[PDB]
């Protein structure tokens, strides 16, 4: 019951092309399976690792803009 927990983190820059494929996917599937990972490593060129991380970082980042005022779709005070 451990998906390998180690203290390894780093930040790097990315292009607008490769990302387009990744970011777009993030919306399709937050938890991409190996197949998807290996498939993305090509559509973007990055490596499985780089992908796995980047994706994981997103979930953390979004959580921020998610609670912040900024938001999509129709929503309001209406009991929901």
Swiss-Prot record:
Superkingdom assignment: Eukaryota
DNA-binding region ranges: 8-66
Protein localization: Nucleus
Protein purpose: Involved in gonadal development.
Quaternary structure and partners: Interacts with LDB1 and LDB2.
Protein name: LIM/homeobox protein Lhx9
Gene giving rise to this polypeptide: LHX9
Residue span relative to the full protein: 268 to 334 of 397
